[PDB]
From Swiss-Prot:
UniProt key word Signal: yes
Keywords in alphabetical order: Antibiotic, Antimicrobial, Secreted, Signal
Organs and tissues of expression: Expressed in the body wall, intestine, uterus and ovary.
Organism, as annotated: Ascaris suum
Family: Belongs to the cecropin family.
Protein name according to UniProt: Cecropin-P1
Major place of residence: secreted
Gene field: ASCEC-1
Positions spanned in the full protein: 14 to 44 of 70
Keyword Secreted listed: yes
BP GO terms, sorted: antibacterial humoral response; antimicrobial peptide secretion; defense response to bacterium
A cellular component annotation (GO) from this entry: extracellular region
Compartment(s): Secreted
Stated role: Has antibacterial activity against several Gram-positive and Gram-negative bacteria. Is weakly active against yeasts. Acts by a nonpore mechanism.
Expression triggers: By bacterial infection.
Length: 31
């Protein structure tokens, strides 16, 4: 969707959260 085509770039920023969500976890940075 031309509407989701501009929002896709907004969700594309979440891809960093999924990649980190497993990374950080894999690092056990926190508790």
């Amino acid at each position: 969707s031309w509407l989701s085509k501009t929002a896709k770039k907004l969700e594309n920023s979440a891809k960093k959260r999924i990649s980190e969500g497993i990374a950080i976890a894999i690092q056990g940075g926190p508790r």
